[PDB]
Design a protein around this nucleic acid. Sequence first.
RNA 1: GGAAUACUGCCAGCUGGGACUGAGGACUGCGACGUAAGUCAAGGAUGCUGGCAUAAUGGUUAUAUGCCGCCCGUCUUGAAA
RNA 2: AAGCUCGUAUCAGUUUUAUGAAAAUGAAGAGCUUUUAGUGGGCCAUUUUUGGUAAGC
RNA 3: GCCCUGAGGAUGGCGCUCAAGCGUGUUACCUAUACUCUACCGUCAGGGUUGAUAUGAUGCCCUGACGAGUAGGCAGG
Lengths: 49, 170, 197, 151, 68, 106
Amino acid sequence: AYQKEYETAERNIIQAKRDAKAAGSYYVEAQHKLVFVVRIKGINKIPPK
Amino acid sequence: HFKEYQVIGRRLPTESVPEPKLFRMRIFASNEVIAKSRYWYFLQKLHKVKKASGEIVSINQINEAHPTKVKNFGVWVRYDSRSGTHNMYKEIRDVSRVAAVETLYQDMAARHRARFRSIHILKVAEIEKTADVKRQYVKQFLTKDLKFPLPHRVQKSTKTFSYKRPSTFY
Amino acid sequence: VEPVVVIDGKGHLVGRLASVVAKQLLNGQKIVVVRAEELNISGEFFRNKLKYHDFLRKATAFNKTRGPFHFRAPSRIFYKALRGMVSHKTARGKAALERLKVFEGIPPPYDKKKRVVVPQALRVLRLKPGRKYTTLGKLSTSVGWKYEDVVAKLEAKRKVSSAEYYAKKRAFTKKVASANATAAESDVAKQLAALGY
Amino acid sequence: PKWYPSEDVAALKKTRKAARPQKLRASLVPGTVLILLAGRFRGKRVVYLKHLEDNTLLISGPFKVNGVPLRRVNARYVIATSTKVSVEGVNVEKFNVEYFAKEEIKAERVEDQKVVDKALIAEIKKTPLLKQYLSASFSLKNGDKPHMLKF
Amino acid sequence: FALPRGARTATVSKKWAAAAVCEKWAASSWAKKIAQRERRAALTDFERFQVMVLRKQKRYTVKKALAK
Amino acid sequence: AESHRLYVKGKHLSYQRSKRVNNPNVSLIKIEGVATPQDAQFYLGKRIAYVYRASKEVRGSKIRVMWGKVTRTHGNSGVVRATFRNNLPAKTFGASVRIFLYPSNI
RNA sequence: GGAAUACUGCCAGCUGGGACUGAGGACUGCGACGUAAGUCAAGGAUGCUGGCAUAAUGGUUAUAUGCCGCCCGUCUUGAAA
RNA sequence: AAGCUCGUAUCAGUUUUAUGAAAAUGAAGAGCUUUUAGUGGGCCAUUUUUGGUAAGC
RNA sequence: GCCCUGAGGAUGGCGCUCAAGCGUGUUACCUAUACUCUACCGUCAGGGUUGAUAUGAUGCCCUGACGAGUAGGCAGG
């Protein structure tokens, strides 16, 4: 069910983008909701805040 | 490698102002993130729109119509340096707009020491007919039946020792 | 690749040639440098002459002899240039330097043996066309070298009878090529041609 | 044995490692001419006949050609060449792991070598210069690049 | 070979076929050298032995011819 | 007959080292005829033997051999890292070494 | 008018070359193949081969050499000094 | 360091929100008596300054 | 934009000029006690253990993280 849901969601997104392109109206892309953050600097000389 | 992108923003439409001016411009960048950042910077500078109330309607990549056709490109560039900002115009004989803008950026970083941070691409246009080019170094390649040699070729050596005394003839 | 490599220093850059020779020495390769006087250095002659003076002007006060040593021979200059590129004052560096020999011209028996060149160190391959350059022999003569006349005199003799040796080799190769041609079109020759030979 | 363990020794846990048959490389095919790299017969061109159950290759000189008898050679210490010689006419099923056991040359071994040589000599002579090529040893020369040479 | 300035792919191919530059290229010693190098790189050990035997025979024949 | 070589001669440059620290456990070996890492990839896993003459005779011979293996490529000039059972004396810098074709895959 | 290719991202797609690790110690569990019996790459390696008692191999001293390492303790001054 | 009550709603070198008092992230190692060694040297450096003229100070 | 003037020593030296100098962009590679996986010592925390253990329950084991440091404190030798 989850695989089918993902496939349907991606197909719907692509179809909506294509329809918006064809209709000449701008597409309202969904706002991002998940982000992955990775530390880059070390554990020293970092300001307290 | 540079790429051409199109970005449009309409400052988060609010009540009584639906569908604002919808500022449109073409931005050359190596990736979508850099294109969006440059679009935001241009909006902040030239216009009064900032990312606080801004919105990216859509970002698209534009491919050159004829990637295998030689063209003469006229570029109007406004760049900032140690001195005050000033306008600049240059002519480039390239095949694609992306290559022309890349060569312009390389020349600016080489001659004027201006880098991508303080360079603005106002407009890129194609020169259709001859005698419209205003730069001699571009007219140089427009001469009919242009033939020239390549004296003193820098041949590459794959081994430290060569028992031939190579000649640079071409 | 070769137990000993003879490098023709004529028309070569001192810096690149010395660097490559030192690198090969550190790899355990024996190299012999010839025609040092013909070595070339980039830049106009006056700049090279001025550069030489400022390194010998530092003569030590208390002990000049035990201090800097100023050598005029082109081979000595090349060795000094290459010496700094090697980790001297150490056993590894000292052993490597033993594998290098520098001579003016081509003294025997090297005169009768094949010699090679370094493409990356050629003056006519690296320097931009039309740029000024300096000759090591002329600089050495200006700074005190007194053997340029004899070096040229006995190098001219080196070309003498070596032109004759090459003429004899050409005559022999004429007959060799004739024998190869008359031996062509045979079954063995046809098979060799088919097999890439 | 009847003797109970006189000291406490922990038994081994049930191991799970099946003895799958060797997955020989494609280049190694019966009848292919092989080149020995290490051993008493290093650098001696030999022929490939059969794959033994002990993950070793049964190779014959043949003995009458270069003196190499029926021997067991590891695959990893052999170079496989594109050249091949017919082997369907040579009987090799008799040889096995127990055949090479060592419990003044065994008479049966000599007879088997003679039979193999007789069977394979016709196939070797089927192509010109094949016997001479097998007899000649293999060695490297200046300018030879194994990573560039084709075998 | 002659070629109009800024010719397209079709015209370039047509002119290439008409000029028959390929035939001239093969006849030149440069293309022959390339082909010989490729063939040598494609040689096999048995082919190398055959080449050695043929070279020995050719050398014997040449030496017999020489000094006569 | 003329030649019995079945190995590719090489040179031992130096141990894997930084600007001021060296790791003798890893040795850098230069292989003749190798100029790029792709070419050196074929030599990975090949046995490396260093042959030298010893003053004393121990096993009826005056030659003592130290064995090793090729681990991975090093740099862009074809240099390949190698690890031996016992590290090299560090006096062999530039010494000739032998690389065999076994274990072979071709 | 029509496909192909470049680029991006996916493959619970396939398959070679190289290096280190073999940790646990009779079964208890999650799993796969198989109608079943049974098998398996499934909570950590097994089988075979070659060297050995005037052994295999290992240990100590200096020299042979790739690199690094300021002379120790207390006390001044925020430190070195 | 020992004791009691305990794991929470005891909190934050964080953010938003609210008023001009409600949520996000993380930690449940948090709360109250007794005493028990040592600790009141300062340097570097941004901003205020204490104000200014060759400068510092 | 670059160059010159414009006021016992060292880009470290060797040295270099389509640079091995300068500016920019892309790949190729080296490493620290830095980071990923695994072998081992110890500390902490949790857990299993007896109609007795196929080794002193102060025993025998499983799980996760951690390990810099002057005076001082605690613990084991």
